[PDB]
Design an enzyme around this catalytic site. Structure first.
Site, PDB file in Angstrom:
ATOM      1  N   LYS A   9      45.422  51.731  61.991  1.00 26.81           N
ATOM      2  CA  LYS A   9      44.805  50.690  61.117  1.00 26.81           C
ATOM      3  C   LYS A   9      43.478  50.524  61.765  1.00 26.81           C
ATOM      4  CE  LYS A   9      46.015  47.881  57.767  1.00 26.81           C
ATOM      5  NZ  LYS A   9      46.930  48.178  56.574  1.00 26.81           N
ATOM      6  N   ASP A  58      42.343  48.290  52.364  1.00 27.67           N
ATOM      7  CA  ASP A  58      43.052  47.073  52.843  1.00 27.67           C
ATOM      8  C   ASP A  58      42.368  45.970  52.409  1.00 27.67           C
ATOM      9  OD1 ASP A  58      45.777  46.518  54.547  1.00 27.67           O
ATOM     10  OD2 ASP A  58      44.355  44.991  55.069  1.00 27.67           O
TER      11      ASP A  58
HETATM   12  N1  LIG Z   1      45.898  47.680  49.579  1.00 32.86           N
HETATM   13  C1  LIG Z   1      47.198  48.219  50.233  1.00 32.86           C
HETATM   14  O1  LIG Z   1      47.391  49.412  49.788  1.00 32.86           O
HETATM   15  C2  LIG Z   1      47.976  47.511  50.946  1.00 32.86           C
HETATM   16  C3  LIG Z   1      47.782  46.121  51.330  1.00 32.86           C
HETATM   17  N2  LIG Z   1      48.860  45.390  52.008  1.00 32.86           N
HETATM   18  C4  LIG Z   1      48.694  44.187  52.490  1.00 32.86           C
HETATM   19  O2  LIG Z   1      48.388  43.563  51.233  1.00 32.86           O
HETATM   20  C5  LIG Z   1      47.607  42.388  51.554  1.00 32.86           C
HETATM   21  C6  LIG Z   1      46.526  42.170  50.265  1.00 32.86           C
HETATM   22  O3  LIG Z   1      45.688  43.235  50.411  1.00 32.86           O
HETATM   23  P1  LIG Z   1      44.694  43.686  49.285  1.00 32.86           P
HETATM   24  O4  LIG Z   1      45.265  43.536  47.947  1.00 32.86           O
HETATM   25  O5  LIG Z   1      44.630  45.354  49.192  1.00 32.86           O
HETATM   26  O6  LIG Z   1      43.410  43.242  49.805  1.00 32.86           O
HETATM   27  P2  LIG Z   1      42.315  42.413  48.787  1.00 32.86           P
HETATM   28  O7  LIG Z   1      40.982  42.388  49.462  1.00 32.86           O
HETATM   29  O8  LIG Z   1      42.237  43.204  47.477  1.00 32.86           O
HETATM   30  O9  LIG Z   1      42.978  41.119  48.397  1.00 32.86           O
HETATM   31  C7  LIG Z   1      43.222  40.224  49.411  1.00 32.86           C
HETATM   32  C8  LIG Z   1      43.395  38.877  48.743  1.00 32.86           C
HETATM   33  O10 LIG Z   1      44.030  37.697  49.745  1.00 32.86           O
HETATM   34  C9  LIG Z   1      43.063  36.705  49.848  1.00 32.86           C
HETATM   35  N3  LIG Z   1      42.912  36.586  51.257  1.00 32.86           N
HETATM   36  C10 LIG Z   1      42.497  37.581  52.204  1.00 32.86           C
HETATM   37  N4  LIG Z   1      42.396  36.981  53.461  1.00 32.86           N
HETATM   38  C11 LIG Z   1      42.683  35.609  53.281  1.00 32.86           C
HETATM   39  C12 LIG Z   1      42.967  34.565  54.204  1.00 32.86           C
HETATM   40  N5  LIG Z   1      42.423  34.714  55.368  1.00 32.86           N
HETATM   41  N6  LIG Z   1      43.307  33.479  53.712  1.00 32.86           N
HETATM   42  C13 LIG Z   1      43.717  33.287  52.369  1.00 32.86           C
HETATM   43  N7  LIG Z   1      43.658  34.330  51.441  1.00 32.86           N
HETATM   44  C14 LIG Z   1      42.877  35.263  51.848  1.00 32.86           C
HETATM   45  C15 LIG Z   1      41.623  37.242  49.256  1.00 32.86           C
HETATM   46  O11 LIG Z   1      41.162  35.998  48.765  1.00 32.86           O
HETATM   47  P3  LIG Z   1      39.465  36.278  48.081  1.00 32.86           P
HETATM   48  O12 LIG Z   1      39.697  36.812  46.545  1.00 32.86           O
HETATM   49  O13 LIG Z   1      39.119  34.633  47.981  1.00 32.86           O
HETATM   50  O14 LIG Z   1      38.833  36.945  49.103  1.00 32.86           O
HETATM   51  C16 LIG Z   1      42.324  38.058  47.978  1.00 32.86           C
HETATM   52  O15 LIG Z   1      42.815  37.303  46.893  1.00 32.86           O
HETATM   53  C17 LIG Z   1      47.072  42.421  52.964  1.00 32.86           C
HETATM   54  O16 LIG Z   1      48.258  41.680  53.797  1.00 32.86           O
HETATM   55  C18 LIG Z   1      47.215  43.938  53.054  1.00 32.86           C
HETATM   56  O17 LIG Z   1      47.347  44.373  54.588  1.00 32.86           O
HETATM   57  C19 LIG Z   1      49.831  45.991  52.244  1.00 32.86           C
HETATM   58  C20 LIG Z   1      50.232  47.495  51.981  1.00 32.86           C
HETATM   59  C21 LIG Z   1      49.170  48.144  51.185  1.00 32.86           C
END
Ligand SMILES: NC(=O)C1=CN([C@@H]2O[C@H](COP(=O)(O)OP(=O)(O)OC[C@H]3O[C@@H](n4cnc5c(N)ncnc54)[C@H](OP(=O)(O)O)[C@@H]3O)[C@@H](O)[C@H]2O)C=CC1
Ligand SMILES: NC(=O)C1=CN([C@@H]2O[C@H](COP(=O)(O)OP(=O)(O)OC[C@H]3O[C@@H](n4cnc5c(N)ncnc54)[C@H](OP(=O)(O)O)[C@@H]3O)[C@@H](O)[C@H]2O)C=CC1
Ligand SMILES: NC(=O)C1=CN([C@@H]2O[C@H](COP(=O)(O)OP(=O)(O)OC[C@H]3O[C@@H](n4cnc5c(N)ncnc54)[C@H](OP(=O)(O)O)[C@@H]3O)[C@@H](O)[C@H]2O)C=CC1
Ligand SMILES: NC(=O)C1=CN([C@@H]2O[C@H](COP(=O)(O)OP(=O)(O)OC[C@H]3O[C@@H](n4cnc5c(N)ncnc54)[C@H](OP(=O)(O)O)[C@@H]3O)[C@@H](O)[C@H]2O)C=CC1
Lengths: 460, 460, 460, 460
Positions: free
Chosen positions: D114, D154
């Site tokens: 990562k 991510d």
């Molecule tokens: N994309 C992928 O293929 C994968 C992702 N994951 C996991 O899924 C999760 C979401 O990823 P993904 O959808 O790709 O990321 P995105 O950036 O597309 O979305 C992340 C979301 O989580 C919110 N968020 C992020 N950080 C925080 C925080 N510290 N406090 C509160 N809300 C937060 C964001 O809020 P805002 O919109 O306000 O910025 C947004 O709504 C993560 O844990 C990632 O590691 C798991 C497997 C695969």
């Protein structure tokens, strides 16, 4: 920035440098250097890696490896490797950060880095050390090279370890080149490299004494308290003795060995050689303190540093490790009449110690002050002679001892004069007050790097 | 070969070299060298590449990048980079072709190359130039290297651009090496590199004047017309003044600046320094022509070269660009009593101008003739000192200004003697007639390269 | 930009693409694509290199080598090598530029490039071709690779040359990989690669005929005029004959061979095989005049193209070289009742020819129009099957002929449908008018590249 | 080991894995796996590097870059990049460590890694993001490659950023290869990759529901509380809706948006698309909550997570970030009748939450328990489809959406069955109690890696 991890040694080094630059006219003349400081303080690159290796019983062992490649504006990354159980990123960043500016003060084209492992050589066999070095270099090799990053020794890494490291680099990369310094004399080493750091400390201090006393005093008959008993301490002690000074103390991680008569007695070369041989074998000074040659001449103090136990003393050369002169120790040295303290060790003095020395300097005219020299200035002779080893290797020739020693001497004299003159320019002391070698050295190393970085587009 | 594109500047350079070889006994002694000429005239490699970069408004810009790697028999490819809106492959082929033979005359192991872009630095900010340099080097880096191809400056490329380029090379390739010359003093530069080309042109012409006049005359008291106002012009002017000569003209892309009293007055170093500062900022001579320091002493002649406007003159040093002395201007210099013309600029004289000077030489004995030296001989000092900058970086040390300058003088004296001696050997002039420096220089550089190529199996 | 050299062929290809983009709604919907046009039109990288090689008499020979790496947004650079005495950078830039957009219409991940040499295979022995190929690959190999740039054949470069090139690449780089396409069947070739371009041209025109007639007509019973007699023409001819059409002409660089009865007769597969055999041996069609079997059936016309000599014809497939159908020839084809013309050759029609066909399409409703397809659409079968060759090599397996041909068919159908649909979208024709396959194919290929380039940060 | 720095997120992940392995029969059967755990938990390699980049005002900016290359026994290192202001080594080590075992559960040959930066995309322009990506990849490129380490997206890294990253990799390395996944459909992307992670979460949960209820229940009519509103949350929500479930909540870093009627109302695809478009533009859900389409249907709660505000609910899919379901939240879900909770987010549940779920499972037979699935099992569909993107790129072909989705479904079903069956083998639950998916998934991922490591000599 509360995402950033707390790195106490790195932050200590950074804050001291930064505070010296702020306590000067530097940012009035070149306010844009604030941006250079913010850039320079984040390393260009850091590699961390697992090191798995086999012990003599055939068991899997795991240690952590590191290489901090801090800055390369002035040259390929340059700096040693530390094998010690305390090692982590914070420590190696302090050291790599220091190295940038130390290297800049040498005049040679060397960037700053440092690396190592939490591998502890103590209690290991030579064969364990060989297998560890083999495994370490198996990963490290891809990140280094004679024009990219040139490591060397430090605590826990001697010519022995540099040998195993070099042999494995050669095996892996199928090249014979100046990829490491501190090499063996028949396989690309430099004469004077073993001696370089402790000789350079002493050489630098000679200039301090000459300036402060207007040529009236020298090391002849001065009493010198040294700490450590490794590479830096050994050869600092030998040069002191050669110049007619008296070495009243050495030490190691378990205690201090102090002459019983500190007014008139000294370690001798033969005693130093005995200590050095114990250290090649990873043993403690404690082993010899009851032998005939030692029981009557010396007091061994388990668990103590030398500084409060040497009585009256003229010069202190901490030569072991970081943060080994406390503020209380500093006050004791001042009360014992010590007038010169230079860091053989990197970041040898704590901040409280430094503040005590510099307040004393500002309160006491000329030769009445204790004059403190930071490690980046005083201990730079090791890395300087490593640069000369690189230059030898690039030329495919070997220089004489006299030639190397002469260059070392000129480098240390220039380094002292640059710290002095820069302190007079940017942090001009009151009338009769000695200029701050720490401020001047810090500013002079920092501005050379900042300006090369600007020229190269690293900041704007 | 009607498939081949028309490349006027390259064809010009090729034709003049070839014509001088033909007008000699070279091909009687070594008819097989016609094969060498046909091979050497097609570059070993050329790289062309798109350069996309971002202006201060955030807008996409597109320019063309080039690196001509003409010949590497005598060493890695070596030669500078030109950023000028005229740049195209023809121009850079003429330059890199010239560089092969110029480099051969220095005695050092340097092949011939040249590169650059149609990016126009004028009207750009420093930040724009930095982003351009970054983008240019992102592609260029993979083709170059301290043992492969070492670029440097030329029109539009100064130490500022070298810095941005070096910094990006280091970031991309993770190596600190002699991949560029013209570098800054703290990061691998050489003393004397700024001065080198202009100094060398004047050093070379001192030999010309000594020979033609049997030691009776020197630069002392001579009136010297210079064109350009950049690196080559500035330091040629400064050395002329140091020698007691009078500089009566400088010029830029918008006009000439001529002293009002060309019989008695001269530019001064302070005036040269003012013009130099304007050029650092990419401004024109026109800007200062109303200042006190300038309005009463000089006349500004927009759109005009200096040659017809300086009156009686003794030496001409075209130091701006190719084809900046026409046949008509050569006839005017001849009528004005000019007796020495050497090219600071690459291919500074048109073919008609060269034909006029050489016809005059052939018709007029000794010191009565105007004597023409080509740029590959007279302007070789810059590249020579770049080879010494490479030498210094390989040694990992820095030489003194006196050491570099002394080597520069020796190189320019040997270059002059080689051209004179070769002309006497292969193109022996009638009694009392000066030998042809252009023919001698051309033969001497060409044969060295041709023989090395044969030794290396490039032709047979 | 009067610094830029004049490159007529490249400028022609560029102008025709740009004009079709302008004559559409594309830049009303996406005006920012004018930036993408300016960036895409400057090649990412071009390498030019000398090629010294030895002829059968032992003599040094010199030719020019090239590789234009035009665009890599969609994949590794991909495109063939041309060995022809006309070769220069202009021509190879037209080719490489065309290849970007052609490759985009295949659906496969292939960027655009092209290369070759002015080396003329005619009059050379096979040994001389071998030594040439060895020398040419010696320099080219460092710039190419299975994931970097994959060359192939074109005029003058057949499976013989691909073999010598592949062997030298293997020898130099010590790798066996899909660095070239057009390889031999036992050493990583693909079934259907020889047939691919010509078959694909015919498959594409079958879709044009089907669309123009709602499936009622096909190649069956059509009279087809072909030019050239190399790889493209041969297999185009063979596929026409297979489908029940009649091939009335073939041609080479010295003249045309036309059946005497163009209303009823055709080349046969045996005849095409005899022509193919001549061409393996670098001989001319003209030899066949001496043979009564051919003289009785055909007329040989030295110095003539077929178009005005075939009488009434239904389909024209120019399959030799660029600019081989003039405006007058186009008018003759129109007058002769030709309703389908597709480029087997790259840029086979002059701009006046294209303009005549496109005017006719716009003026004539339905099946009365002549319908023109550009090479980037109709000739894309070759490079498509090269991409399949690359896929087979990455899989380490060999596909059947039926598998490859099935894929080729689907790629040509998809290509046709994209050009048709994109024209309907961006350049919607009047009721009853056929959509422009040249405009549609140009917009389709261009938008795919421009968008990928945007995503990748090549422009913004 | 008090030299080691405190890394709370990493230690949390490590302790949970370790505790599940200890609470089983694994180390009774394979006590030697304790050594594998000690080895595996120290990353093979970690790179950290400075990233200097330029903002739209022309100012120098500094951020920290990272790549954690944790384990490569099963394949090249594989895992995404996070651009978020919280980023540091601790966080990226937790994520890289998780990735090892997640990847192992996919069945594909992918090691674990990562990376990312503390760069914050919020408040930056697209141009700033492009310049940052350019600078980031300038260093990262040397450490990655299609057979070495393949990054992806991510938090904070979408298809936009992968585009700028890929373009710069291609420019630097002159190769077009599967060096990143999440690429654009025309430049080596896979269909189903945008959808993959949220679809896979939902697919996995279907299997949970089927097992727990003996096929009696499904997502049809279930109420599903989701957190986040990015890539994972969007497509989890869309799949839930497609299956006839009702999505009662989404959220972002500033608050939660919940339907007013949670018994019967749901987000719709159109609403999700609106939210997604705000997120492409780096805006907050808060911006739309007063629009017509939202003010009456939803309640926006600033500063709150959804879990205690949704009333009664059937399924919870935390999909935002680590540690976003507290123990109190977990108790609230249990009291609201939630019976299935699966981590879309990595380490989404706190330890207290997990302990609450697993105690509930052990205390309540069959369908009466809340069944918790860890992220390494439930969210593995994203990385699985990245592996299929690598496989496409290696084949040089593109698969259909149906083909990719079918493989995704089989991978998620196998992953569920492996966690279930392994929990039954090594941690056999009491009669009628559901097996621990967390224990079983952890053991099954860990043993596959440990055994491959042993085979490869990483431990013995
Ligand atoms: N994309 C992928 O293929 C994968 C992702 N994951 C996991 O899924 C999760 C979401 O990823 P993904 O959808 O790709 O990321 P995105 O950036 O597309 O979305 C992340 C979301 O989580 C919110 N968020 C992020 N950080 C925080 C925080 N510290 N406090 C509160 N809300 C937060 C964001 O809020 P805002 O919109 O306000 O910025 C947004 O709504 C993560 O844990 C990632 O590691 C798991 C497997 C695969
Ligand atoms: N070698 C070089 O060229 C240079 C070294 N330095 C600095 O000089 C110092 C000494 O290095 P060097 O002589 O090469 O190393 P050595 O390993 O040869 O010697 C180190 C000495 O310091 C003691 N020591 C190390 N760690 C500690 C600790 N945590 N507490 C108390 N004592 C300790 C050792 O004790 P024991 O013998 O009991 O193990 C030993 O006497 C370091 O600060 C190093 O970074 C500076 C410039 C150059
Ligand atoms: N630098 C070096 O080491 C060497 C340079 N050379 C040659 O010397 C010449 C000058 O180079 P250098 O001094 O480095 O370059 P600089 O860019 O420093 O200076 C060039 C001078 O020439 C003027 N100039 C440039 N192009 C034209 C043009 N097309 N028409 C009229 N005037 C023009 C410039 O005008 P303005 O100030 O208005 O822009 C400037 O005064 C060139 O021929 C170069 O190749 C030869 C050997 C070594
Ligand atoms: N091979 C491939 O896969 C593809 C090729 N193309 C294009 O198709 C065309 C034919 O290529 P290909 O069949 O492979 O090449 P070949 O070398 O096999 O055949 C070329 C034919 O064109 C003739 N010819 C070549 N140059 C000229 C000229 N300047 N004037 C007149 N006739 C000429 C040759 O005549 P002679 O026999 O007298 O030399 C020969 O009949 C080219 O435009 C090529 O770029 C397009 C797509 C793919």
């Amino acid at each position: 920035m509360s995402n950033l991890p707390v790195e106490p040694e790195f932050e200590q080094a950074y804050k001291e440098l930064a505070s010296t630059l702020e306590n000067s006219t530097l940012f009035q003349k070149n306010p844009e250097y604030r941006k250079a400081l913010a850039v320079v303080s984040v390393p260009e690159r850091v590699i961390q890696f697992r090191v798995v290796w086999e012990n003599d019983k055939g068991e899997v062992q795991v240690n952590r490896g590191f290489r901090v490649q801090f800055n390369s504006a002035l040259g390929p990354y340059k700096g040693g490797l530390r094998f010690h159980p305390s090692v982590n990123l914070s420590i190696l960043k302090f050291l790599g950060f220091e190295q940038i500016f130390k290297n800049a003060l040498t005049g040679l084209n060397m960037g700053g880095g440092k690396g190592g492992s939490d591998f502890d050589p103590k209690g290991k066999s030579d064969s364990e050390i060989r297998r560890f070095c083999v495994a370490f270099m198996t990963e490290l090799c891809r990140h280094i090279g004679a024009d990219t990053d040139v490591p060397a020794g430090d605590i826990g890494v001697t010519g022995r370890e540099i040998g195993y490291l070099f042999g494995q680099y050669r095996k892996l990369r199928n090249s014979w080149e100046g990829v490491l310094t501190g090499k063996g004399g028949s396989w690309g080493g430099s004469l004077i490299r073993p001696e370089a750091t402790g000789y350079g400390v002493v050489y630098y201090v000679e200039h301090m004494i000459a300036h402060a006393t207007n040529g009236a005093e020298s090391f002849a008959g001065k009493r010198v308290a040294i700490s450590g008993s490794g590479n830096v301490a050994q050869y600092a002690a030998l040069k002191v003795i050669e110049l007619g000074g008296r070495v009243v103390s050495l030490s190691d991680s378990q205690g201090s060995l102090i002459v019983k008569d500190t007014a008139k007695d000294s370690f001798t070369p033969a005693e130093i050689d005995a200590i050095a041989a114990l250290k090649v074998d990873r043993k403690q000074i404690a082993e010899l303190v009851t032998d005939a040659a030692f029981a009557d001449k010396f007091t061994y103090l388990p668990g103590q540093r030398p500084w409060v136990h040497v009585g009256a003393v003229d010069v202190a050369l901490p030569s072991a490790t970081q943060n080994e002169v406390s503020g209380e120790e500093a006050q004791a040295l001042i009360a014992a009449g010590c007038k010169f303290i230079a860091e053989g060790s990197n970041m040898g003095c704590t901040q409280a110690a430094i503040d005590a020395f510099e307040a004393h300097r500002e309160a006491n005219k000329g030769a009445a002050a204790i004059w403190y020299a930071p490690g980046k200035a005083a201990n730079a002779g090791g890395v300087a002679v490593s640069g000369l080893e690189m230059a030898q290797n690039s030329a495919r020739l070997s220089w004489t001892a006299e030639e190397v020693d002469a260059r070392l001497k000129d480098i240390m004299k220039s380094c002292f004069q640059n710290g002095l003159d820069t302190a007079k320019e940017y942090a001009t002391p009151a009338d009769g007050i000695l200029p701050s070698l720490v401020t001047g050295s810090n500013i002079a190393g920092f501005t050379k790097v900042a300006a090369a970085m600007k020229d190269q587009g690293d900041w704007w």
